[PDB]
Design a protein around this nucleic acid. Structure first.
Ligand SMILES: [Mg+2]
Ligand SMILES: [Mg+2]
Ligand SMILES: [Mg+2]
Ligand SMILES: [Mg+2]
Ligand SMILES: [Mg+2]
Ligand SMILES: [Mg+2]
Ligand SMILES: [Mg+2]
Ligand SMILES: [Mg+2]
Ligand SMILES: [Mg+2]
Ligand SMILES: [Mg+2]
Ligand SMILES: [Mg+2]
Ligand SMILES: [Mg+2]
Ligand SMILES: [Mg+2]
Ligand SMILES: [Mg+2]
Ligand SMILES: [Mg+2]
Ligand SMILES: [Mg+2]
Ligand SMILES: [Mg+2]
Ligand SMILES: [Mg+2]
Ligand SMILES: [Mg+2]
Ligand SMILES: [Mg+2]
Ligand SMILES: [Mg+2]
Ligand SMILES: [Mg+2]
Ligand SMILES: [Mg+2]
Ligand SMILES: [Mg+2]
Ligand SMILES: [Mg+2]
Ligand SMILES: [Mg+2]
Ligand SMILES: [Mg+2]
Ligand SMILES: [Mg+2]
Ligand SMILES: [Mg+2]
Ligand SMILES: [Mg+2]
Ligand SMILES: [Mg+2]
Ligand SMILES: [Mg+2]
Ligand SMILES: [Mg+2]
Ligand SMILES: [Mg+2]
Ligand SMILES: [Mg+2]
Ligand SMILES: [Mg+2]
Ligand SMILES: [Mg+2]
Ligand SMILES: [Mg+2]
Ligand SMILES: [Mg+2]
Ligand SMILES: [Mg+2]
Ligand SMILES: [Mg+2]
Ligand SMILES: [Mg+2]
Ligand SMILES: [Mg+2]
Ligand SMILES: [Mg+2]
Ligand SMILES: [Mg+2]
Ligand SMILES: [Mg+2]
Ligand SMILES: [Mg+2]
Ligand SMILES: [Mg+2]
Ligand SMILES: [Mg+2]
Ligand SMILES: [Mg+2]
Ligand SMILES: [Mg+2]
Ligand SMILES: [Mg+2]
Ligand SMILES: [Mg+2]
Ligand SMILES: [Mg+2]
Ligand SMILES: [Mg+2]
Ligand SMILES: [Mg+2]
Ligand SMILES: [Mg+2]
Lengths: 114, 155, 68, 97
RNA sequence: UGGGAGAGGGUGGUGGAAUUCCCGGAGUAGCGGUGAAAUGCGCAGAUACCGGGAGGAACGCCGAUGGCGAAGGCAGCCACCUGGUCCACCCGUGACGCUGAGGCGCGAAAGCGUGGGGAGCAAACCGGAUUAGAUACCCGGGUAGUCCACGCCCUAAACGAUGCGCGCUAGGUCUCUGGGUCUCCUGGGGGCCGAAGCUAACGCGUUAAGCGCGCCGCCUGGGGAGUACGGCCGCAAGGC
């Protein structure tokens, strides 16, 4: 069991996946917009993310998780609602950092982002 | 409509109970402009929920109204290329109106023959908790709870 | 609150003045605009070019995680 | 069903049928052809062929004029195709965003 | 002579972010994608997360209505080699000048030949959708090619649809780069607005499309047609 750890939010236009890990970054448990029961574009909404965050706290708290630094990646719509849900869950949420990957103009992107 | 909110008609209180909501139900019973008939069908039922239930028609009546008032409803909206079922909160004017409408409707499905009997027995089941009248409310609500995912698409 | 004010004279080429240079970077390690440094077009070029060498020597970051 | 009205002219069951063979083009879109009505007539310049048809997604209404009677029928069907094909695909555009 | 600015060009190095793949760990019922979906991927352990590694390509912020080039075009950072150009002194030469049919060189991309490289992307192609149908648009895959060297090809909305040089004809303003004596004054660029004037109008206007001189290229109704024949060039495609 681990009392302190990391909560990751991968927030995309299609979905919000949330995984909670240990202080060493190795996953304890994870939820997602599909896990709580949605298919298709529903998996992208904030309610979708809100359920995945809460099922992720609900999950990790059952292992003794208490404190979590929050890490956020991606400009999804259900993003800001995922962080609220983590705080209003009962987890010490000691930080929020945003490690969103931006390339310094690297690989040419697919036609739909050009 | 297209220029301002039309004003809600106030309705005169009745003369058997002096209530403004007992009247607004009387109307919903009334067919082809025969209000005298709308009265004696309703009132006969008030006798009924007294004969078979030692309590107050106006008490049974109003409680059944608060038992069919749909707190949440869905109201469609075409977002992008799909007509989603967005969950709107309901106006207490509309809650009133749907409850009164669904009562007679859920009543005028019942099996017993005379109308006044169906109006009492449906108010005698909605005031308690059961009845097809309440089912409409409970169904409509679960239709909105199931679609709270789109509750942000509200206006 | 412009950056060039909160700093008396300084060399716009001393790539080893991490203390002065680091102020010209945003809280996400990025090179700040002219609207925020107050350097003219002429001098803003030399700032950026020496931030970039300072990064290569390792004295300055290329990017920083955003905290809240 | 399919109704045909020759106003102030005489035509034949054969000619009337040729109209039906020509409205059948609109069946290509596989949408309901509700009470289609073909009105024929003769101006001092050539024939006029009118048509009102309603579908699940709207009505079609056009008029084709020409010297040749049958050539007016094609132009009428020419304009009816365009109105129907728009009714079937106009709502497809505004899907994004 | 003495200074400046700059993604100008070439060569050799090297920095960090991101994607993909492989390896280690940890973990599980989905992930991905769309307008909504499905193909696809996933209990043979995916996605999400941490560590290790390989590799190619492009350089985030700065970055701009910006800078440079004769045009095409040029953007991490370092160094070498190299071009064009502006400024200030008014020292030297002594009309040495302008243009320029031919000629020669340069010439985005795509394409070609030999060899290398190949992460991402992606013609062709396959499959899913969309749809009346959908040889498309959207989605999941994917080969040339995109990248390096050398050699070809020589095209373009190669655009300012505005050839070059010189002179002359209000100004206001914003900006880049110099020089003063630094308020401001003046040179060289980049725009905007406008005097006169021009223009069929739209618009141009000291960055002329105004007023003038020199020289070059070019036009002479639309289609046929940038086609045919011929000739030259090209490996071919195809170019003139
Ligand atoms: Mg989705
Ligand atoms: Mg009714
Ligand atoms: Mg009903
Ligand atoms: Mg019940
Ligand atoms: Mg008929
Ligand atoms: Mg007749
Ligand atoms: Mg007839
Ligand atoms: Mg046709
Ligand atoms: Mg049309
Ligand atoms: Mg010199
Ligand atoms: Mg591959
Ligand atoms: Mg693994
Ligand atoms: Mg990794
Ligand atoms: Mg930019
Ligand atoms: Mg420019
Ligand atoms: Mg002299
Ligand atoms: Mg002399
Ligand atoms: Mg010359
Ligand atoms: Mg020549
Ligand atoms: Mg070329
Ligand atoms: Mg090429
Ligand atoms: Mg080939
Ligand atoms: Mg080839
Ligand atoms: Mg090749
Ligand atoms: Mg070969
Ligand atoms: Mg490959
Ligand atoms: Mg296909
Ligand atoms: Mg198909
Ligand atoms: Mg077919
Ligand atoms: Mg396809
Ligand atoms: Mg594709
Ligand atoms: Mg691909
Ligand atoms: Mg091939
Ligand atoms: Mg080949
Ligand atoms: Mg090529
Ligand atoms: Mg080459
Ligand atoms: Mg251009
Ligand atoms: Mg030019
Ligand atoms: Mg031309
Ligand atoms: Mg030119
Ligand atoms: Mg100046
Ligand atoms: Mg100065
Ligand atoms: Mg220039
Ligand atoms: Mg100027
Ligand atoms: Mg102007
Ligand atoms: Mg004038
Ligand atoms: Mg003239
Ligand atoms: Mg001027
Ligand atoms: Mg002057
Ligand atoms: Mg100029
Ligand atoms: Mg002109
Ligand atoms: Mg010339
Ligand atoms: Mg001709
Ligand atoms: Mg050609
Ligand atoms: Mg030939
Ligand atoms: Mg040719
Ligand atoms: Mg030519």
């Amino acid at each position: 069991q681990v009392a302190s750890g990391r909560a990751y939010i991968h927030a995309s236009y299609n979905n919000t996946i949330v995984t909670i890990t240990d202080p060493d970054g190795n996953p304890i448990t994870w939820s997602s917009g599909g896990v709580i029961g949605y298919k298709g574009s529903r998996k992208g909404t904030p309610y979708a993310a809100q359920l995945a965050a809460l099922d992720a706290a609900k999950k990790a708290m059952a292992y003794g998780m208490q404190s979590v630094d929050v890490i956020v990646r991606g400009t999804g719509a259900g993003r800001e609602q995922a962080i609220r849900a983590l705080q209003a869950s009962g987890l010490q949420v000691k930080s929020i950092v945003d490690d969103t990957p931006v390339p310094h103009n690297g690989c040419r992107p697919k036609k739909k982002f050009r | 409509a297209r220029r301002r909110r039309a004003e809600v008609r106030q309705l005169q209180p009745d003369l058997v109970y002096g209530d403004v909501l007992v009247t607004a139900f009387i109307n919903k019973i009334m067919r082809d402009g025969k209000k005298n008939l709308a009265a004696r069908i309703f009132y006969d039922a008030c006798k009924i929920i007294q004969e078979k239930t030692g309590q107050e028609p106006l008490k049974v009546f109003k409680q059944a109204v608060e038992n069919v008032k749909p707190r949440m409803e869905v109201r469609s909206r075409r977002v992008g290329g799909a007509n989603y079922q967005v969950p709107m909160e309901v106006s207490p004017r509309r809650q009133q109106s749907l409850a009164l409408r669904w009562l007679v409707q859920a009543a005028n499905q019942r099996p017993e023959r005379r109308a006044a009997v169906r109006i009492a027995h449906e108010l005698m089941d909605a005031a308690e908790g059961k009845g097809g009248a309440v089912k409409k409310k409970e169904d409509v609500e679960r239709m909105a709870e199931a679609n709270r995912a789109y509750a942000h698409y509200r206006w | 609150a412009k950056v060039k004010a909160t700093l008396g004279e300084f060399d716009l080429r001393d790539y080893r003045n991490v203390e002065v240079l680091k102020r010209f970077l945003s809280e996400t390690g990025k090179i700040l605009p002219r609207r925020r440094t107050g350097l003219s077009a002429k001098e803003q070029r030399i700032l950026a070019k020496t931030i970039k060498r300072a990064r290569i020597l390792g004295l300055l970051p290329f990017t920083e995680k955003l905290v809240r | 069903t399919m109704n045909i009205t020759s106003k102030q002219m005489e035509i034949t069951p054969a000619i009337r049928q040729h109209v039906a063979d020509r409205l059948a083009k609109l069946e290509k879109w596989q949408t309901h052809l509700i009470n289609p009505h073909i009105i024929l007539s003769k101006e001092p310049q050539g024939f006029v062929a009118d048509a009102t048809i309603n579908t699940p997604n709207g009505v079609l209404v056009a008029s084709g004029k020409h010297e040749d009677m049958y050539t007016a029928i094609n132009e009428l069907i020419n304009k009816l195709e365009r109105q129907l094909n728009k009714l079937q695909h106009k709502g497809e555009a505004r899907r994004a965003a």
